[PDB]
Amino acid sequence: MVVKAAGLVIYRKLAGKIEFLLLQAYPPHHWTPPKGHVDPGEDEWQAAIRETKEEANITKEQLTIHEDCHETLFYEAKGKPKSVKYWLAKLNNPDDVQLSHNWKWCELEDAIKIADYAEMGSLLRKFSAFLA
Numbered sequence: 778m779v780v781k782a783a784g785l786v787i788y789r790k791l792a793g794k795i796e797f798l799l800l801q802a803y804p805p806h807h808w809t810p811p812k813g814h815v816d817p818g819e820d821e822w823q824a825a826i827r828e829t830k831e832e833a834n835i836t837k838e839q840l841t842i843h844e845d846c847h848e849t850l851f852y853e854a855k856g857k858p859k860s861v862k863y864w865l866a867k868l869n870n871p872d873d874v875q876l877s878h879n880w881k882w883c884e885l886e887d888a889i890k891i892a893d894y895a896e897m898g899s900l901l902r903k904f905s906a907f908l909a
Contacts, residue, residue, distance in 0.1 A: 782861040783825040784812025786904055789871040795908060796882040797901060800832060808891045812861055821862045834875050842866040846907045848900050865904045
């Protein structure tokens with residue numbers, strides 16, 4: 778049985794534009810939204826929230842999570858089949874966010890380009906249409 782992981786596609790709306798938060802990850806350091814392995818006694822939802830805290834330093838009260846917008850990707854990688862379930866979540870106040878000074882805010886096209894992963898590109902387009 779597949780290994781389970783979860784995360785959130787974080788977005789913001791600034792100056793009329795929708796931008797997605799991407800983080801540069803362990804070799805080979807691909808760029809992806811915040812995510813990680815589901816722990817014992819958690820479901821995917823709980824895990825997406827916890828991983829967003831650990832990886833992006835964004836906490837639950839800063840977000841509105843869209844329960845009706847989610848998708849699951851399948852990674853066949855280094856031998857270990859793994860699924861990653863994502864929900865779309867809005868950073869409500871972009872003026873109050875504590876990120877390090879390995880991350881970027883990206884509009885759809887640019888996001889696809891640096892994610893450089895066909896399936897993630899398809900997911901981001903699905904979430905963009907949901908927002909429209």
